[PDB]
Design a protein around this ligand. Structure first.
Ligand SMILES: OC[C@H]1N[C@H](CO)[C@@H](O[C@H]2O[C@H](CO)[C@@H](O)[C@H](O)[C@H]2O)[C@@H]1O
Ligand SMILES: OC[C@H]1N[C@H](CO)[C@@H](O[C@H]2O[C@H](CO)[C@@H](O)[C@H](O)[C@H]2O)[C@@H]1O
Lengths: 649, 649
């Protein structure tokens, strides 16, 4: 048996790890299936994509087209439906009718063997009709056959009868396919909308306390939820909610020794009060948590818990499962590290003595929180645990609970970042915060929206508690407005960490991406009411961006994204499209100086002619404009970061 | 089970059609095996390639290195041995000694728990020692262990004893490998030297006749062979040697009607005198052919026969196996075409009524010629026959006779050309004749010497009976010298069609790549004795190039090729290396004007640092130079087309 079929179909894409891991999509997401297809000789080929759902039912007739002349690369868009494991194949075939038409349209007007040519056509349309299931449709073709064979009409008339729009339509839906050859099926994992699309908000419950009780509880923290929902977020991500170790607890500003009532780092998990399946006592009880989750749920907010597979020296695991740690010759366990960062308050897990016990316990813990309504987990530093461990854990959980979403916080090298997504992580943190110039953004988003979109779904946090980028530090509020627009419009999932709205941008020191007085090591109460009254919050802009996202399907997908050229280095322009919805964004990346630019739109990329001019509405202001192949923009930092326009019909 | 192992090993290359076809090499050929290798956490990894021969026997320890900082892409060079089907895997592992050494070199000078660190080292070296086979190497490690543990000594001395060259050498041979993880085996097809390396000469036996008998026989054509061997060729490629059809036989200069004794095209195979398993009666008998093959063998020449799977209308198959042809409704068979070329003298084969019958007869025919010493077939237009037909035919023949070499004459789109190589064609014709500027040559050869070399072996014919490129038409003798040097030094396999050495360069008409009075349609007697006497032949240049090739392993491989910058667009420079053999070539692509240029060698690519100066000898003249990072050259058409230098020892 041969590797290549009768009509060659090769290199079907997308493909992940040569077909051993599934490509990814979510419900309603479109993406391109492509292949290299050609045949021997000079005649025509056709091709089509067969997408099969988890029960094996094929989707609609989905013909492909050659994507560029002379390349033999064919593609078609398919759209993912219900969640589950799908498969797709590419079918290739000889296309004799197209070939016959090409020749017939030439030889008949030249009077060359017209009777032979027309009879050959009749025979083709007959074979075509044989496979047409609808009775009026076969009759349409047989009428063409009979007209083709009618020697009493002029040849040109005989041919025209085979080329009518009604014949074309039957053949469009039921073409005559010679020597149909199929690729081997490739797997597709379709997951729920939220895996691709959502707005995230991170905050520390303990910071939302009272004058009398500064350490917030789930009961008090629940008060922030309406404000978070009102800003248009969908997911609330909480730092670890478990007891915190006392041994080597870190003090304020990441100092080595905690003093007094210092609350320590939430990531330093575990004490006699309990481990990863328990609640920090100052946060309250499990019932309080349930209350928080229920209240979050009523406002359209899902909870994402941090899962940080590591232990303070006081975690129960240290004595219950010593073999889950690497011990030095004197029995001590070296603290964890992420060079040059040091985590003196914690132990790393060792995986090679009892990998099974660790997997069993990990999925037990996850299922515990899942039983209490948590269907999303933000996994802390997954790249310092074995890759196959996450592969196994995620497969175990999604096997029983496929809706659970895992988000990889892996700020590391590209191979590891990609592999984690490929072995099952639904979402990935990305290099976004370190992409701030037009070139960086353009290059990086081209990567994320390109081939990588086949296994990775990016979550654009404009800040995190560990990342206050120099761009925000130097740019102030105008920089925050810019990054929110970018994050919100370039990825269907974005997030901010509480305080971003207030443009908090004081670094620990010059050259650091840490916050001064970081919330990681201390309660950080915020005057939300005053900022609202004094207009010193960009919460309304954040709110508008999420509203715009909620109203424009184009911003709820990733793969359709195109950058349009501008004549200023500081001004970036791009469009995203989903069906009839087109959003075009123009952003001034300069947070300090007004920039004027001409934006030259790739009109055909927008589905338009070059001379054409179209109505747009700037969704940030309500202004209406008419934009064409060359558009003037003037963006003044502080007054306006960007135009976020929808194309009006 | 997980798809990823304990230590990730991903995307092993070379790979062809995701592992469904073998990558290729020939005996003695080196190539790079690469993989993506990394681990969780921050500790070091190591990797190595395990290349296994047809009996499953592993090669030597072949450690890999990271190819570029931060990429996690690792590679090592391997070398193919005996012919057959090999396999290769990549092994990845934790490298605890490298990890420990890095930390120990830092922690010991710092005074940070040095006893603990040294004891950790002792335990490692004990582990390392346990696997070590050598009586003396193990005691070397165990001595380092004792020195590490000697608490009566200074920390620095204790550490230093673990870092001696003696210890480095032991661990370099027998490293301690943690958590060894293997990729899945990939197939490697190793074939005989001639598949990659050889010089080809195409000529028509019928043209080598006599005054008294103009149409050559195999006995007269054998007298041309000594001159051919003397030019340093290894392979003689003969156009089809079968009876030639009379129906619709073509006349001189590709005219529609043969007249008188026009001999017709050899590619119009078949008459009642016989088909593809027969000899043209004017060429003689099978005994005469056997004599011809024997004479070829005495001179070190292999015969390559043209295999053209097509028929004149007089071929016995036409009526014996009508279903091997596509018939029009009036019963006629349309002549073959290669648009805009027309082949009115032949019918193309149809493959889908009796594919088994066709495959069976094809391999019967090939095996017939194989039994008479033909171990190479030049396959005419394989791309108008099914790709899977060739995969089947080649698999059948090489299954019993793995030494047989198939050369694909497919001048077509890249996908088909590549696919034919991948499904089994040992060699491919290329775009070489249409690559004549420095940029064209540079780009094209970068492609051929890169990833494609894992599946395609190029045969650079500077001309064919169908291709007289304008460069040769316009440039005369100096252009022939140039393309000969280029062809001979850029590919380990190259060729010419007889008359090339006489600088035959008269086109059929301007703008054509056909020869006037093409040998395809008439006897083309050439006065070889006179041309040699009068010095109107570049046979001596051809002879020198093949001698240089026979003497320099660098010119007998493909993948090591580097282009070096020059300051004149018309002057190209490149190097090839194999072991200690380095060849440096500089060619003046201008056939009409003397060119002076500076050649700036990338000295590290030659294995030299930038200030070094090296002796070279131009093997075309015997002149010796001293060349360094910047070298003056002056190349004069008709006198010095190029420098072909070997680096002297
Ligand atoms: O997603 C980033 C988070 N993943 C790190 C390790 O768990 C977190 O480190 C924090 O938590 C650590 C342990 O509690 C402290 O040692 C660090 O100083 C502190 O920054 C960090 O916030
Ligand atoms: O390697 C290219 C060769 N593959 C073509 C088809 O067999 C060859 O065509 C030749 O042979 C044909 C059939 O005899 C003629 O009709 C053509 O005019 C003649 O050029 C051509 O030499």
């Amino acid at each position: 048996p041969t590797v290549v079929g009768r009509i060659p179909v090769l290199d079907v894409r997308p493909v992940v790890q040569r077909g051993r891991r599934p490509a990814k999509a979510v419900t309603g997401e479109s993406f391109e299936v492509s292949a290299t297809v050609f045949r021997e000789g000079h005649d025509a080929v056709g091709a089509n994509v067969v997408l099969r759902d988890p029960r094996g039912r094929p989707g609609p007739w989905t013909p492909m087209r050659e994507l560029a002349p002379g390349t033999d690369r064919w593609g078609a868009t398919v759209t993912a439906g219900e969640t589950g494991t799908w498969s797709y194949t590419v079918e290739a075939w000889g296309d004799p009718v197209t070939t016959w038409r090409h020749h017939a349209r030439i030889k008949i007007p030249a009077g060359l063997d017209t009777d032979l040519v027309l009879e050959e056509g009749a025979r083709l349309y007959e074979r075509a009709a044989a496979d047409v299931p609808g009775r009026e449709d076969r009759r349409e073709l047989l009428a063409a056959v009979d007209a083709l064979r009618d020697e009493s009409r002029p040849a040109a008339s005989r041919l025209a009868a085979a080329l009518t729009p009604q014949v074309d339509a039957v053949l469009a839906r039921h073409p005559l396919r010679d020597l149909v050859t199929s690729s081997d099926p490739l797997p597709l994992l379709v997951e729920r909308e939220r895996a691709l699309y959502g707005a995230w908000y991170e905050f520390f419950p303990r910071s939302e306390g009272t004058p009398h009780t500064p350490h917030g509880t789930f009961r008090t923290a629940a008060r922030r939820l309406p404000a978070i929902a009102a800003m248009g977020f969908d997911v609330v991500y909480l730092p670890p909610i478990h007891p915190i170790g006392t041994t080597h607890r870190k003090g304020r500003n990441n100092t080595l020794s905690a003093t007094g009532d210092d609350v320590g780092s939430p990531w330093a998990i575990g004490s006699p009060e309990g481990g990863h399946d328990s609640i920090h006592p100052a946060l309250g009880t499990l019932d309080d948590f349930d209350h928080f989750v229920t209240e979050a749920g009523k406002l359209g907010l899902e909870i994402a818990l941090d899962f940080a597979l590591q232990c303070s020296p006081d975690h129960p695991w240290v004595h219950k499962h010593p073999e889950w740690f690497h011990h030095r010759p004197d029995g001590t366990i070296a603290h964890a590290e992420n060079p040059p960062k040091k985590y003196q308050d914690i132990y790393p897990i060792a995986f090679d003595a009892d990998p099974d016990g660790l997997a069993t316990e990990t999925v037990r813990i996850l299922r515990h929180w899942m039983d209490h309504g948590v269907r999303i987990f933000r996994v802390d530093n997954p790249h310092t645990k074995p890759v196959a461990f996450w592969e196994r854990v995620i497969a175990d959980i999604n096997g029983t609970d496929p809706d659970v979403i895992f988000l990889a916080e892996a700020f590391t090298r590209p191979a590891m970042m990609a592999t984690l997504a490929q072995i099952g992580f639904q979402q990935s943190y990305t290099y976004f915060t370190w992409r701030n110039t037009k070139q960086e953004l353009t290059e990086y988003l081209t990567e994320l929206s390109g081939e990588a979109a086949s296994y990775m779904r990016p979550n654009f946090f404009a800040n995190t508690p560990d990342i206050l980028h120099a761009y925000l530090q130097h740019g102030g509020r105008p920089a925050f407005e810019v990054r929110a627009v970018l994050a919100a419009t370039l990825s269907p999932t974005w997030g901010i960490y509480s305080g971003y709205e207030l443009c908090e941008n004081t670094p620990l020191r010059e050259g650091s991406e840490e916050y001064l007085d970081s919330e990681k090591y201390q309660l950080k109460p915020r005057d939300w009411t005053r900022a609202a009254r004094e207009g010193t919050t960009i919460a309304p802009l954040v709110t508008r961006l999420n509203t715009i996202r909620r109203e424009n399907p184009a911003l709820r997908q990733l793969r359709d994204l195109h950058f349009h050229p501008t004549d200023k280095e500081e001004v970036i322009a791009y469009s995203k499209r989903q069906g009839s919805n087109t959003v075009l964004v123009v952003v001034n990346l300069d947070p300090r100086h007004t920039q004027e630019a001409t934006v030259s739109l790739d009109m055909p990329q927008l589905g338009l002619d070059w001379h054409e001019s179209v109505p747009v509405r700037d969704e940030l202001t309500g202004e209406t404009y008419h934009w064409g192949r060359a558009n003037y923009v003037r963006l003044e930092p502080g007054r306006t970061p960007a135009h976020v326009c929808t194309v009006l019909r």
